[PDB]
Amino acid sequence: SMNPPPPETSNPNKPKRQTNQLQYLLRVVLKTLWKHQFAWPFQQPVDAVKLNLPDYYKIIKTPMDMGTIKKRLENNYYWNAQECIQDFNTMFTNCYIYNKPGDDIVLMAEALEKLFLQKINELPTEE
Numbered sequence: 001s002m003n004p005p006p007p008e009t010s011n012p013n014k015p016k017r018q019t020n021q022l023q024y025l026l027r028v029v030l031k032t033l034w035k036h037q038f039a040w041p042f043q044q045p046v047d048a049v050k051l052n053l054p055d056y057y058k059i060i061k062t063p064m065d066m067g068t069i070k071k072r073l074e075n076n077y078y079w080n081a082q083e084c085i086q087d088f089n090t091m092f093t094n095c096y097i098y099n100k101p102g103d104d105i106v107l108m109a110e111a112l113e114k115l116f117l118q119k120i121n122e123l124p125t126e127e
């Protein structure tokens with residue numbers, strides 16, 4: 001069994017910025033979700049070998065996880081907040097597409113998404 005390489009977290013030729021909106025996405029949004037009791041399944045890429053999910057990467061073609069998002073925020077990978085917000089939404093959507101309603105992993109994603117939506121609702125205006 002085989003995992004794909006993780007998503008890119010470093011690219012010297014990709015343009016990037018340090019902005020108050022991206023600082024908020026690390027300091028408020030990522031920090032809030034990361035410390036949550038249901039964060040652990042989302043803190044690293046889905047390991048299809050260890051989890052015995054040989055079909056995972058047949059169904060999910062844009063993998064994303066909070067470990068990758070945390071690295072992208074800490075290593076200033078992003079140009080804007082929308083790029084980072086899309087990564088969170090990709091992570092949640094992948095969970096809902098692969099799994100079934102009421103599955104433990106879906107209940108965990110739903111709890112994290114509720115907090116995500118609450119925090120993004122108060123995304124500050126650009127300075």
Ligand SMILES: Cc1c(NCc2ccccc2-c2ccccc2)cnn(C)c1=O
Pocket residue numbers: 040041042046051053094095098099104105
């Ligand atoms: C389908 C799927 C996963 N499957 C396993 C799982 C399921 C529920 C809770 C926890 C884990 C887990 C987490 C880490 C290690 C071992 C099991 C796990 N994560 N995601 C995002 C999934 O979609």
